[PDB]
Every structure is written in C-alpha cells, then in structure tokens.
C-alpha cells in the first residue's frame, strides 16, 4: 500500500503555513489521523521572505497532518522537518506569495510514507 | 520500457525558453512525436528574474517536445506545467542566465514518462 | 546492496565546501575511499551568494569523498559536478550561511550510487 498523490500541488494553492489535503487527491492522506507525519520522495520547495518583499527558497521533505472538520473533512498539511531520532516534527517557514510564476510544487505520483509511530 | 536520460542537462545549455533534445542522449526522446509531454522523476530547476537582475528559482516537472528541423534534427523541449485534468501544457518562465555557478539540472538516469494522450 | 543514507543532512551542518561523512549515518559511505564519487537520487540544494546581500540556490547531484584526519576519521563529502564522459569531478559553489530557516537538505533514505571507476 504505497501512497501516491493523484492531484498536483500548485504554489498558488498554499496558505501561509499549510495547504488542504484534498488537493493531493489521496484518500489515505485525507483520512490520516491528526499528527500523522509523512516523508515525501520528492522535494517540496517553499519560497519564503526574510523581509523587504524579497523571495528566497527553502526545501522540505515532511508533512504533518492537521485533522479536518465538516467544512474541510480531509484537513490540512503543514510542511516542516521530521527528526527521526527524537521523533519530533517542527513546522517550516511561512510561504511567501508575491509575483512568482505558477508552479507545480509536487506532481501527481509523489510517494508519501508515514514515518511517525 | 522506461525512458532514462543518458546525458546530463547543464544550466549553461539552456536557451531562454528551451533546450535541445540531443543533450539528454535519449533516442526515444529525440524521436518522440511533436507535442508529446513527459513527466520527470526529478525536479527541473529554472532560475528566472522578474526584475533588477535578481535571480529567483522555479520548479518544473514537465517537458513538451517540439519537433526538429534540418538544423536541429532531434528538436527541443520546453519546460512547463502539464494539467492532467484539462490535458493542457503551459510553457514555464524564461530562464535567466547571469552569474550562477555551473550546475547539472537533470543528471544521467532521469526518468521521463509520457503523460499526454 | 543499494546505499541509503540513515541520517538527515541539515543545512546548519555544512561547512563552506563540505560536510562530514558521518552525518549521513552510513557505514558504506564512511568507509568509501578518498576520491569515490556518488550520484544522489535526490537533489542537494546549496545556497550561495553573489555577494550583494542575497541568497540564491544551486542544485547538485554528486558527492566526492575526501580522506579525513584524527578529528574526522571518516572524512568529508564535497558537492559538485561529475562529468561521466571525461570522468572528472568539479567542486561546486561555496555554501553561504546567513539567516536561512533550518532545512533537511537530504533526508533519510537518499540513495547514493557510486559512479567513478
Ligand atoms: Ca532573495
Ligand atoms: Ca535572488
């Protein structure tokens, strides 16, 4: 049971710190419990800004599930860092939306592997 | 049969909006039908600039074949976005060549999967 | 025997042109001889600067082993470019450490393939 995305994640679909699970088109991700952490087999690049409206670029390989509700049953994911030794997830930097060209950050077929207990 | 690149794509080989197919060293790519779209298993990073000579970086996962001519018999690829729902390809941002270090953007062994039709 | 990393490479562990082999948590990598070159199945993103105040990003797919000393017995890897035709390795750009968010550049499970002869 390898979990693969079935929908593309576009940069214009990111909120400041998360995105909706539904975008990835994966029932396993949609039903994953709160706090589940996944490692991606493809990098998730996140443009950020340290100030002055300037864009810089970060890379993340891990997503943490935030359980949904009636309006958004599939919930959300935050990108960040999974420490496999200490078993900790740390949220990544906020996404900065400016004038970047539209991009598929994670394409269809991205493999997601649960890494927490 | 899986199509793998046999030659590295270097950043200093990109034109503003394409690169020559021959660079990838793949006969299946060289003779792919005009307009064929491929998804990559590795990100293609394209440096761009929206102004002031400032470089930012975009990611692409899709290439569209442009048929050759007598001068370039194997033709070209453009990078861009494949919409697998609406079955459309949109060319990506222009590559901005300035003072970046030389880089292999796509190494030997990159897997290319046809996704159109 | 595919070689997979067992520890994450964090951006805050990079020196200007190398990092300690031991960080990747792999005995095969640790014992690899001076001069061994590996290709990665995942991009290694290296932030650099042109020197006017801004962080840009380069991509590398190759590492070369450099023999260590009493303080770092397993030695170091440098990122760079492997030319598979001419059998040459060229060191990549200096890493620029500024105020970037902490990032896993290469996660656990990155596959390293020896490519020098
Ligand atoms: Ca910047
Ligand atoms: Ca810049």
Author numbering:
A (entry chain A), B (entry chain B), C (entry chain C): 7 to 123
Kindly provide excerpts from the paper associated with this entry:
Here we report protein crystal structures of a piscine betanodavirus, the Grouper nervous necrosis virus (GNNV), in four different forms. The overall topological structure of the GNNV CP consists of the N-terminal arm (N-arm) (residues 34−51), the shell domain (S-domain) (residues 52−213), the linker region (residues 214−220) and the protrusion domain (P-domain) (residues 221−338). The S-domain comprises an eight-stranded anti-parallel β-sandwich with three short α-helices, which is a canonical structural feature similar to other virus CPs. The P-domain folds into an independent structure, including eight anti-parallel β-strands and a short α-helix connected with loops of various lengths.
